[PDB]
Design a protein around this ligand. Sequence first.
Ligand code: FMN
Ligand code: FMN
Ligand code: RLM
Ligand code: RLM
Ligand code: ORO
Ligand code: ORO
Lengths: 335, 335
Amino acid sequence: YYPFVRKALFQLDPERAHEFTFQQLRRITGTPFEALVRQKVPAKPVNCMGLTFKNPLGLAAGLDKDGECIDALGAMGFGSIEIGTVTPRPQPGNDKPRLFRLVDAEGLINRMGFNNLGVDNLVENVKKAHYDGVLGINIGKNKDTPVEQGKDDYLICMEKIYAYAGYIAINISSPNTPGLRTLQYGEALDDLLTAIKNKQNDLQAMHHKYVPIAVKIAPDLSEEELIQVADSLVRHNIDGVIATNTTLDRSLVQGMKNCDQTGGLSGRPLQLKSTEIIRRLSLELNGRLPIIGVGGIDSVIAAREKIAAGASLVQIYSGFIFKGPPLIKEIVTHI
Amino acid sequence: YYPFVRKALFQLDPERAHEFTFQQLRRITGTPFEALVRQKVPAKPVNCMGLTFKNPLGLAAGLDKDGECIDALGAMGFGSIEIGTVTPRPQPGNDKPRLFRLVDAEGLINRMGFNNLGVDNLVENVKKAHYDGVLGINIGKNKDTPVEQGKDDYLICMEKIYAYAGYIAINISSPNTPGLRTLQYGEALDDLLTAIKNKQNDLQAMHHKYVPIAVKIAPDLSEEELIQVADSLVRHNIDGVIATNTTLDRSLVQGMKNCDQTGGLSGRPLQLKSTEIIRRLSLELNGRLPIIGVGGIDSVIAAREKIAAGASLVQIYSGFIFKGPPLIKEIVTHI
Ligand SMILES: Cc1cc2nc3c(=O)[nH]c(=O)nc-3n(C[C@H](O)[C@H](O)[C@H](O)COP(=O)(O)O)c2cc1C
Ligand SMILES: Cc1cc2nc3c(=O)[nH]c(=O)nc-3n(C[C@H](O)[C@H](O)[C@H](O)COP(=O)(O)O)c2cc1C
Ligand SMILES: Oc1ccc(Nc2cc(Cl)c(O)c(Cl)c2)cc1
Ligand SMILES: Oc1ccc(Nc2cc(Cl)c(O)c(Cl)c2)cc1
Ligand SMILES: O=C(O)c1cc(=O)[nH]c(=O)[nH]1
Ligand SMILES: O=C(O)c1cc(=O)[nH]c(=O)[nH]1
């Protein structure tokens, strides 16, 4: 019964709670105790980006940044698992504390800084996984890499993960790496999308398989910024768009503890804004490429609203923390 | 702890559950036995419609249709309580079964037909109350009254309740009295508002009392229809608008039990639509009169989302059933 577990884990700070939870998941992955987290969810396959997903609910990136719990998290019913974000070289990320709960808002604020162990380590973790669903691999730029040379970091990771990823996610939407969000704008985006698609085409020739690429945008794009982003994604033949990442907005959490903490806001305070972006994004795209909707999905209806907005799949992070594995079964069963 | 109270309660038919819970609330309302349901909530006064509201959260109309349990419900923490809808003459409403619970959608479908005991009985009940919040009295048209002479039902009700109401709510948005929603459109609304505004002027000189009037609209109005409603309300100097009532939409509940049932939908499947209506209404109204936001509110952020769309107050109903009294404490405390 999750609410009791939640009350217990919430006595820890959010990052220590995750570290404690991942300790348990590692200690049961492969064990006859691994069934302790297995969940029977109805099958609901969906074809998206040429891939066939178990069901339309995936685990958003940022929970398993290094991909060390794919099997246990996959047993919970997720139709897909997105690991990352990972960078070429490992890096520590921002200083702690860098993660904060807004319990009354059922939201989180984070300035992690791409804390990860590097792409090579992720590949080794992936090689040991048995997940039968779709594996997304989310890559980003190292902090020290210059913004205008950020493409290189994605291309490096793409080469190491192509043979192992079900699909690849391009993170240019974090608020916590300096200048990463400028890669969403004008020439920077076109320059980047070009480099990525040419690398994709060269890796298809080398590995004799097409791995789709989806770009993860931010929810703080203006209407004109979003139209340009959509257009650029169609012109470069990107296979998907993940909308959205966390928000700089605080207008809905004013007066609550940790509302002035720098970083990106997620959970319920992001739901509405995320949904509106997907709807505007869907209208621009006009079905030319699919949308993976994410942001504050904490219920069957909330997930259906994202589908109505124009999304083909959905992801969850904060609602899995605040409402637990039951929310997985809810969404898969009734979406 | 509500989730366990709800499991039991939900074993009963929606309307049987109301009868049983209200039988209990009737034997404790106005008596020291309402310590059983009392909740301490902080003071959060809001000025709206020339009145002072204890706190921004109110109980939407339709739960205490006859005004039997004002004190008990007030003890639960509501800053305002809207009783009704009540008609001039009693009427049984539509045939049972007329109330259906979704549950996976945390929504409700109802076709009650204004089941009430008449305005005269309500005034007697209100006479016994001792509620220090704002009491709203919601009045509607008797079933058999010609839509053309619907105004007469409203004027009759107004005279009988003016002396006892904090504000009067004009329900012309129910989908379950045939042709009542046409009073939202064109000069039908223009005629109704002229009569109501004139009765209000009279009743204020008669009773030496200021009583604002608010019109409760439907969520299924078209853009053009909403612009005309907004314009009509400003022109006729109506003091406020309650947006919104239940919806005929079912796009979000497809595939769920009772989704094809006839009537109005409420709860989570109405939250988004209700917020959009409020946003566009507020844009039209441009602060010339306040909005009471209602529709699928089941969280502090959902309540704040309606505040952000333009509402000055908020009401809950379906959320009260699915989340319980804790929602009152949550919303008043953090809104
Ligand atoms: C602690 C934390 C870490 C995250 N890390 C990543 C990440 O590494 N890469 C990424 O693309 N998104 C990351 N996200 C964003 C989520 O994947 C998700 O898109 C966002 O939080 C909105 O979804 P939600 O409201 O369901 O949480 C992170 C979010 C949180 C709270
Ligand atoms: C069973 C039921 C009875 C209702 N009765 C009335 C009513 O008598 N008068 C009225 O104006 N609204 C009535 N409503 C509408 C609600 O007060 C409210 O406006 C609507 O359900 C949206 O609020 P909610 O989604 O938070 O429940 C009723 C709703 C339900 C579910
Ligand atoms: O199956 C799971 C694996 C890891 C987590 N991580 C987690 C992450 C955060 Cl921010 C928390 O506050 C808690 Cl209690 C747990 C939660 C569930
Ligand atoms: O304090 C209260 C008084 C009456 C109700 N009505 C009610 C209404 C419905 Cl649809 C239910 O499924 C249940 Cl369990 C109760 C709910 C709470
Ligand atoms: O700092 C991170 O790791 C991070 C946070 C966030 O919200 N989004 C993202 O892509 N990265
Ligand atoms: O029939 C009713 O009581 C009824 C239902 C509804 O959704 N709205 C309303 O005003 N009345």
